[PDB]
Amino acid sequence: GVLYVGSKTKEGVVHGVATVAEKTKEQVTNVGGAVVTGVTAVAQKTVEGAGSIAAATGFVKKD
Template sequence: MDALKKGFSIAKEGVVAAAEKTKAGVEEAAAKTKEGVMYVGTKTKEGVATSVNTVAQKTTDQANLMSDTAVAGANQVSEKAVEGLESVVASAGLVKSGELKHEEQPPADAGQ
């Protein structure tokens, strides 16, 4: 009988030891899973932020390009309008064509 009790006691200790190791293994696995999920979340967040910043920068670049083009177009239109007015004034005889002088203005983005 003592042999049976001793055998069951040893078996019980084995089951307890296995349960403790299983518990420790599950806790470690849960910690690693949490760490992995947090890492993926952080990388996803960084990726989204980078994408948003890239889109914002490209939008800003395009807006600047559009405004530069609009300013250049407006300058050309106003230059042609002035030339047309000078032509009308000269042909009407209000001013002699030699009296008209063109003042060169620097381009709008020359100071940048």
């Protein structure tokens, strides 16, 4: 179907994904999949059919 996205913006500031760590021992940072950001952000039909986004984090630490 028709999807109209109109916008008349002025002085637009956008921050996306932020991450801060400090005084840590082990650091893991997994980002992605469908990260869309911006003044005019559109994300249509991310997954269709048998598709998948397995954005996991297999932290095992088999001590």
